[PDB]
Amino acid sequence: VSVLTMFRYAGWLDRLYMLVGTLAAIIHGVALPLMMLIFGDMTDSFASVGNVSKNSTNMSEADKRAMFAKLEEEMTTYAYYYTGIGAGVLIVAYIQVSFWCLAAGRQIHKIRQKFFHAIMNQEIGWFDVHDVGELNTRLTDDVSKINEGIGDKIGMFFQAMATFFGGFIIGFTRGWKLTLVILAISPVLGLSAGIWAKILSSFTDKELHAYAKAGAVAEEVLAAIRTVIAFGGQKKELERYNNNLEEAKRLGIKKAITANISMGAAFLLIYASYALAFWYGTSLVISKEYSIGQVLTVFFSVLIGAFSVGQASPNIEAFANARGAAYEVFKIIDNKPSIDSFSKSGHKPDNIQGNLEFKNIHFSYPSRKEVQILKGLNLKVKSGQTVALVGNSGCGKSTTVQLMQRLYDPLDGMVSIDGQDIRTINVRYLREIIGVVSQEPVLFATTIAENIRYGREDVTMDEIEKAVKEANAYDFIMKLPHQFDTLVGERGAQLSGGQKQRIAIARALVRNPKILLLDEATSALDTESEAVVQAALDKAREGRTTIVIAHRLSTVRNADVIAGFDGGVIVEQGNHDELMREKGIYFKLVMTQTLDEDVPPASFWRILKLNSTEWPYFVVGIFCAIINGGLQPAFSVIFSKVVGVFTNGGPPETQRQNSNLFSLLFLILGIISFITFFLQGFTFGKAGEILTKRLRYMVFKSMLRQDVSWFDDPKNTTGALTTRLANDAAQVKGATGSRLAVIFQNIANLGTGIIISLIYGWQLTLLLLAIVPIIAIAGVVEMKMLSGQALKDKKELEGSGKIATEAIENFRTVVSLTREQKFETMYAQSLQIPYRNAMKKAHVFGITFSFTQAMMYFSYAAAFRFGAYLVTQQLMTFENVLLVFSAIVFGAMAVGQVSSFAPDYAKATVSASHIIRIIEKTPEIDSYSTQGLKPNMLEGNVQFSGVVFNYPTRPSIPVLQGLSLEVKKGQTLALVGSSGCGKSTVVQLLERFYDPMAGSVFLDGKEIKQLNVQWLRAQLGIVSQEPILFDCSIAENIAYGDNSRVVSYEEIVRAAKEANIHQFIDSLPDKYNTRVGDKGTQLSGGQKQRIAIARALVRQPHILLLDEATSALDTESEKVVQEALDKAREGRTCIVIAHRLSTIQNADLIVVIQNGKVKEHGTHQQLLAQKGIYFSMVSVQA
């Protein structure tokens, strides 16, 4: 049910095609082991012919007859075998995949649409809670996981039955208690394998989790770097914790590693154990009873069974996951909560006109406990009027303006439109009949026209034309390029909020209501526009009855009535002069107011070269690698031997021959490998450890040392970098361990196979190598195309989903709801196309998969057939075919390798290239001399000449175009610019973060072009807007490890002293010892700046960069700090730059720079004397 069933609902000819495909799956699995059996009977006839071949030494002609007999005979049998099966799979494989999509396909389509409309209907809850972000995200993420859940489930079914029926059909049928010898030994061994192996496997995971914890404590902060570049470079705290925990769980999860290893050793040691009881119990039960050399088929086949239970397991996992996902957040999906609103049938007050009536309504936000903002409120408002709501402490005004749209049903009491109660009339209708314009005016990415059209679907540009013009929009929309068809460069990002807002008004204007709510509308907008905007509002509302809430008491006046609010609290109602005449709230408040990137450079064999660089040595590992390899073909022969030396030979000793080869198979594989792993995993794994550590280090310092427009002008977020660090070291480790499983698999498969290929008598050797390359080639080609379709669909769906987020992500739609389905509808179209395309690709997956299995039979058949070729009287055609199985199984061996161990190279090589380009870099500023700190360079006179520059992005021309100023010593360079850039760039430039594109500078005596950077920054009393401190105790922060500068206590005290942060230092728990506590949050920026300043005056500079420092503070913070910055200066030169146009008066040389070019300068009154620019600045300052 629900879980599983709801999970699998929706589907007539769906459910039917489904059960059909399941069936195909069934028969298919059954194919694999039937195929086993037949391999058996062909093999038996093969023994009989080899047995009499063994006898030989007699009637030659009867050998030519007995032989061409079974030859051509089983030759017929082989034919009908590849046939029956072969054709079989092709047909049914294609069928089970047609299961996959036909099913999941339609099933999701249905899902998809229900959810789209579902979300769009959850209404005010979809704001009430839900990250919304986390939502759309889940829309796609989950929807898809459902998909995988369905077609893979099919895969399982199929295998569930090749295992079930195999282990059965043969696991019993053949042997009658011998097949049980199977059941017995076999399933039992298989038991020890499953347990022990899986035991450690869980053990492994636990190892990996503890790893993860250590890796986070391997992270810490890595941002704020600007502050940290003027700091120097942590460099050692990072390494410290890094290699600490890493090494730890390195070798540790590396024991579980060398335990995954020790695990390969498990399953495999225990694999050859299989071989043990396998052959053992076999041989005994082959010299006594059931003497066939065909126990093979049986036991061997039951083995196939185990393997299949494996594949079945991952498929099942898939199912369950997709279930959990959909099903649970499906009740989140399907489910039709709503009721807090709806958008269907209802009541219709077509009387048009009427008065609003807020009657005795209490209400608290959706968040169950906040105060009932509307704490019992009554109000009424006549028609054609326009009422002003006046509040400030938030939480009310806006809200009544809220439910006046039924946004939320009234907690208690009620409201009435016209004369009926809001709740009673239908929504779509209400919402329409209620024009509304709030602050944030949002415009979807489209033409102006289309946005107004959103206001009203059907409607002709003649009406829009009217609309705009009515909302004074007609002018700009006309001069602006393209006209109404002009767009809106992705989101409402292209024009001024002023016009945005206007456009809106137009939108709502075509909606043409009878109620109009203006939520501060005009607000948060430039003054002049505010005018124009309110202007359009005016020409809009009187026709309509309107409730407006706002702060511009200036635009309040003309209120037919006002009401007193201020954070949920109704009081004084009435006309202006009345609420002023009251000298109450109105009057009161009235007077109070007066992460993408991927790069082309690869690294052909380079990270190999550099590999070994990132390497000490471990030939040892590669050593056993070679052995592991041989180990495999070895098996090929040891087995081929058994069967051989028992399918044709001398009677006595066959027990010892058996028994021997049996144990041989065990001791050999079992041990050798257990070993192989243990060892190799030890050495090579350790290579992964180190490589990754000495790597995270290498890279990190590369960054610390790096700098300049890296973060100075990036698109390499803190994340992108923490990312790089962790993920990349890992990956690379991968590129090296890979070179290892390379020499290895290599020798094994080929080398060994080829030698034994010599003993191959050129008729199979060749017979196969042709086959393996082709079937191998399939593995590849198939997976390839499978990816193409996967990604491309991700694209089409991306168009759709991208736009479905546009909506859900923009709820400021339900506002009008005049799009709803219309919306998700446009997306119904998009889908539509990717849907038809989906049915096809369904088919595709099928044909492909199938064709692969057809290769299955083709391969085998041709093989065994050709091999057998010519056994007329006993010729070069006999047992050797078993070594043929050896080279076929060889190709399959290497297959294990590609589909196992480290990341398919790839992502690892990519990651390598990446972390390599990053580790290469250009220090740009480590050491250097460019002076020798001469014991006189203390003057501190700053020189800026020519100074032309633009932070790399130069196309936006520079913000410094031919600049030149300077600053005497022990004094104060006053900086007053336009805004933002300019003041910053200057500072920086001194800090020589970015070097001027032309011209030069002299902190005193010579090219702050070429002066030793580290020293240049030795002196820099820098303190900016947003201070900051990494979490050391403030005593340490204070002690900002500028360099060798030791934590001079009394020094840190000197700072705290003139810092005036001492006020917190005197008492405040733990005093200096108090860590910034939680990275900061526990102290006002005022105190913070006190510390920053400390830091600085602790450095005992000579020059100072006071970048608008206090430009966000208040009273005694501001002031006291100016007292700090005060005594902080005059002892040294300092460019105090700011937007404190006021307190800037105490300046030595005040320069008025106009972004790029300096236009005014001199002393204050002298500047005013120069009535003009600086003047206007002071005249606006008022």
Tell me which residues touch Hg ion (CB under 5 A).
100-101, 151, 395, 624-625, 628, 676, 680, 972, 981, 1030, 1032, 1129, 1134, 1136
Residue among 520 and 728 whose Cβ is closer to Hg ion: 520
* Residue 1131 near residue 1138, CB atoms below 8 Å: no
Judged by DSSP in three states, 15 sits in: helix
Residue 841 CB, shortest distance to Hg ion, in Å, is: 7
Residue among 606 and 812 whose Cβ is closer to Hg ion: 812
Closest listed residue to residue 690, CA positions, set 743, 613, 606: 613
Residue 845 CB, shortest distance to Hg ion, in Å, is: 5
Distance CA 866, CA 37 (A): 20
Could you tell me if residue 481 is left (phi over 0), alpha (psi between -120 and 50 degrees) or otherwise beta?
beta
The residues facing 1152 across adjacent strands are 976, 1160
* Residue 18 near residue 103, CB atoms below 8 Å: yes
* Residue 1059 near residue 1016, CB atoms below 8 Å: no
Residue nearest to Hg ion (CB): 680
Residue among 427 and 1035 whose Cβ is closer to Hg ion: 1035
Residue among 532 and 981 whose Cβ is closer to Hg ion: 981
Residue among 624 and 807 whose Cβ is closer to Hg ion: 624
Q: How far is CA 606 from the centre of its chain?
A: 29
Residue among 488 and 1153 whose Cβ is closer to Hg ion: 1153
Closest listed residue to residue 882, CA positions, set 645, 1137, 536: 645
Residue 251 CB, shortest distance to Hg ion, in Å, is: 18
Residue 250 CB, shortest distance to Hg ion, in Å, is: 19
* Residue 572 near residue 584, CB atoms below 8 Å: yes
Closest listed residue to residue 1074, CA positions, set 1027, 1032, 1046: 1032
Distance CA 284, CA 1099 (A): 88
Which residue has tokens 């049910």?
1
Judged by DSSP in three states, 389 sits in: strand
Residue 784 CB, shortest distance to Hg ion, in Å, is: 16
What are 1129's two structure tokens? Answer: 């200066």
Which residues contribute to the annotated binding site for ATP? 391-398, 977-984
Residue 627 CB, shortest distance to Hg ion, in Å, is: 7
Cβ-Cβ contacts under 8 Å for 1039 (sequence gap 6 or more): 1032, 1045, 1047, 1048, 1051, 1052, 1098
3-state secondary structure 475-529: HHHHHCCCHHHCCCCCCCCCCCHHHHHHHHHHHHHHHCCCEEEEECCCCCCCHHH
Q: What is the DSSP string of 116-167?
A: HHHHTTSTTHHHHS--SHHHHHHHHHHHHHHHHHHHHHHHHHHHHHHHHHHH
Residue 233 CB, shortest distance to Hg ion, in Å, is: 13
Residue 680 CB, shortest distance to Hg ion, in Å, is: 3
- Classify residue 1033 by its DSSP letter: B
Residue 237 CB, shortest distance to Hg ion, in Å, is: 7
Report H helices in 648-759: 654-666, 673-705, 709-712, 718-758
Report H helices in 416-473: 427-433, 448-455, 461-470
Q: What is the DSSP string of 604-672?
A: TTHHHHHHHHT----HHHHHHHHHHHHHHHHHHHHHHHHHHHHHSS-STTHHHHHHHHHHHHHIIIIII
Residue among 468 and 1038 whose Cβ is closer to Hg ion: 1038
Cα 555 to Cα 87, 297, 718, 796, 908, distances in angstroms: 84, 94, 46, 49, 64
Distance CA 456, CA 450 (A): 9
Cα 83 to Cα 97, 141, 846, 859, distances in angstroms: 21, 43, 20, 12
Residue among 373 and 808 whose Cβ is closer to Hg ion: 373
Judged by DSSP in three states, 378 sits in: strand
Residue among 879 and 1004 whose Cβ is closer to Hg ion: 1004
Residue 944 CB-half CA count within 13 A: 28
Residue among 516 and 625 whose Cβ is closer to Hg ion: 625
Residue among 603 and 1024 whose Cβ is closer to Hg ion: 1024
What are 490's two structure tokens? Answer: 């992705």
Count other C-beta atoms under 10 Å from residue 360's C-beta: 14
Residue 142 CB, shortest distance to Hg ion, in Å, is: 17
Residue 769 CB, shortest distance to Hg ion, in Å, is: 26
Residue 777 CB, shortest distance to Hg ion, in Å, is: 23
Residue 439 CB, shortest distance to Hg ion, in Å, is: 15
Cα 609 to Cα 606, 709, 906, 919, distances in angstroms: 5, 30, 17, 15
Which residues contribute to the annotated binding site? 391-398, 977-984
Report H helices in 1100-1171: 1115-1128, 1164-1169
Residue among 2 and 393 whose Cβ is closer to Hg ion: 393
* Residue 388 near residue 559, CB atoms below 8 Å: yes
Residue 187 CB, shortest distance to Hg ion, in Å, is: 31
Backbone angles phi, psi at 945, to 5 degrees: -125, 135
Residue among 186 and 676 whose Cβ is closer to Hg ion: 676
Residue among 66 and 1134 whose Cβ is closer to Hg ion: 1134
Residue among 241 and 476 whose Cβ is closer to Hg ion: 241
Residue 1136 CB, shortest distance to Hg ion, in Å, is: 3
Distance CA 352, CA 337 (A): 31
